[PDB]
Design a protein around this nucleic acid. Structure first.
Ligand SMILES: [Mg+2]
Length: 580
DNA sequence: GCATGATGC
DNA sequence: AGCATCATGC
């Protein structure tokens, strides 16, 4: 039974009501400078479909879009906000975003269209987007009659679903999470994405040029040491050369064949000169394919800017993800790749890159939630926690902890945050399970509060059905009751880790909101460019650096008050690389 | 389409 | 070993 609506040829006052479900359709997955395919409005006066050329050309409609007192309910308002920024139009008054509401209620649903969100509440009078647009080569906007009905049905679903979603969020104590954290953050992310990050493409091409020389040399060498040529990127090919031709030990059997994972090659290095070369070629190869070629593919030719899209409704812990390009996984560990960062520069003359990062926020969050006296005292003294953990588990004074002891204690700290298991630690440290179990037992002896939290959080997940973070984000863990040990253990690890990684996500998100408000009050020209889990990257006039040095760390450190202090380090320079 | 293996925090 | 995205091979 088709849905009734007015396919309007011009905007009417009836369509500019104080509250409405609004759909501003952008079908292209990447909405940056993308077309707005159609518009639907549903309010007390009825259901309307508007052609974009006509609506966005109408001063009253545009004014209505920008009037913050006219409330709109939408699904993925950030997509609309950004598509509109590229057209010079401001969207204001979004009081409810169904995508974010669905995500908070249950991140696992994987809700990515109005249909999926509506199904959560047994509402199925709307089609999935893929059903009407198709996928890939078949993706396409349908003719007006079909397009118009789909947008109206989506707007109708949003109009109908807003109350039940808000009611459940309030029952979950997530009402403020949506209205005071995620929705305001959505606007900040739209600004970041729209601003983009300037790329020195010439520097990138230079690098790409040199990289190509090195790759050839390492490749030729590999063929030499191999006795002949083969596809170094072909797993099969590599495995035959390594384990058959060269007779290297197979101390890790892949499904049916051999493993050439990094740690395995790392273990075989001692046996043959070719292994070191293979790992280096993989290193350089990743730089070339993803951080040079792949990057250059998404840089805008006119402005030389890259505009990522932060997916705010994807991760199971509350973190953001970044795509096209992923600006959250730019190399930094190895110097060769870290240089890629020299290509990320300020967007204006005489501006600089400013980077601020939390120091051990996960462990500090753990100290707070576990209320472990020893861990809390360590952060109160601002000690190096890895040296401190080594001192405690290996029972030695600071003077006697060796580099090897610190390295292993650090690995224990990682395991504790990830959700500890003797096998996971054994694998990471390349030791036996019993030895790893011993390290863990000694850890819990020194940090009994943490031990109690890990036991308690697992029982709680079992009792309630989910775990939560500081700001009430939640994650259901059905598998925690599974009778399969491996399946149950993965859930137990999630129970242990989620509240830590998730609360750290909550904190930095609130810091971003607090920071922008401070930035605005001060009328500073500085603005956010990126967020990479526990760090914020901005660019600003060189004349604002001194102010930023005091402002950013303070806002980040004060975003939330924990039982231990929060500490933020910062650096700035002429490129992202120099912001160290 | 999925596995493998790289990158980040 | 927790959470992610991208390029490649088959
Ligand atoms: Mg850090």
């Amino acid at each position: 039974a088709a849905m009734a609506f007015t396919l309007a040829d011009r905007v009417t006052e009836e369509m500019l009501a104080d509250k409405a479900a609004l759909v501003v359709e952008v079908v292209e997955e990447n909405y940056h400078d993308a077309p707005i395919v159609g518009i639907a409005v549903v309010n007390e006066h009825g259901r309307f479909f508007l052609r974009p050329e006509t609506a966005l050309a109408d001063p009253q409609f545009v004014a209505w879009l920008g009037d913050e007192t006219k409330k709109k309910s939408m699904f993925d308002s950030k997509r609309a906000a950004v598509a509109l920024k590229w057209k010079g139009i401001e969207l204001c008054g979004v009081s409810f975003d169904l995508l974010l509401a669905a995500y908070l209620l249950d991140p696992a649903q994987g809700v990515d269209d109005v249909r999926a969100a509506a199904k959560m509440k047994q509402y199925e009078a709307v089609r999935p987007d893929e059903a009407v647009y198709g996928k890939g080569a078949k993706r396409a906007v349908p003719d007006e009659p079909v397009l118009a009905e789909h947008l109206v049905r989506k707007a109708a679903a949003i109009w109908e679903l807003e109350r039940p979603f808000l009611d459940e969020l309030r029952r979950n104590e997530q009402d403020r999470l949506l209205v005071e954290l995620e929705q305001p953050l959505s606007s900040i992310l739209a600004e970041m994405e729209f601003a983009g990050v300037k790329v020195d493409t010439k520097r990138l091409e230079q690098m790409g040029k040199e990289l190509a020389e090195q790759l050839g040399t390492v490749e030729q060498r590999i063929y030499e040491l191999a006795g002949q040529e083969f596809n170094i990127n072909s797993p099969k090919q590599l495995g035959v050369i390594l384990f058959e031709k060269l007779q290297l030990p197979v101390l890790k059997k892949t499904k049916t064949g051999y493993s050439t994972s990094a740690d395995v090659l790392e273990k075989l290095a001692p046996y043959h000169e070719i292994v070191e070369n293979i790992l280096h070629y993989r290193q350089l190869g990743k730089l070339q394919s993803t951080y040079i070629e792949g990057l250059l593919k998404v840089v805008r030719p006119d402005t030389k800017k890259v505009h990522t899209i932060f997916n705010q409704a994807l991760t199971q812990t509350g973190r953001l993800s970044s795509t096209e390009p992923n600006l959250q996984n730019i190399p930094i560990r190895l110097e060769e790749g870290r240089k890629i960062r020299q290509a990320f520069v300020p967007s204006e003359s005489d501006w600089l890159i400013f980077a601020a990062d939390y120091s051990q926020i996960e462990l500090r969050v753990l100290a707070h939630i576990a209320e472990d006296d020893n861990l809390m005292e360590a952060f109160r003294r601002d000690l190096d926690i890895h040296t401190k953990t080594a001192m405690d588990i290996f029972q030695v004074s600071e003077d006697e902890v060796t580099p090897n002891m610190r390295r292993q204690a650090k690995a224990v700290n990682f395991g504790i945050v990830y959700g500890i298991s003797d096998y996971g630690l054994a694998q990471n440290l390349n030791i036996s399970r019993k030895e790893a179990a011993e390290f863990i037992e000694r850890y819990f002896e020194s940090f009994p509060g943490v031990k109690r939290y890990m036991e308690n959080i697992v029982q709680e997940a079992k009792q309630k059905g989910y775990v939560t973070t500081l700001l009430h984000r939640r994650r259901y863990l059905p598998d925690i009751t599974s009778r399969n040990f491996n399946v149950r253990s993965f859930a137990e690890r999630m129970a242990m880790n989620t509240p830590i990684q998730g609360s750290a996500a909550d904190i930095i998100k609130k810091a971003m909101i607090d920071l922008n408000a401070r930035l605005k009050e001060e009328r500073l020209q500085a603005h956010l460019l990126l967020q990479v889990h526990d760090e914020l990257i901005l660019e600003a006039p060189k004349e604002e650096m001194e102010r930023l040095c005091r402002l950013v760390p303070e806002v980040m450190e004060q975003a939330v008050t924990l039982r231990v202090p929060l500490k933020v380090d910062y650096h700035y320079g002429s490129t992202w690389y120099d912001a160290k």
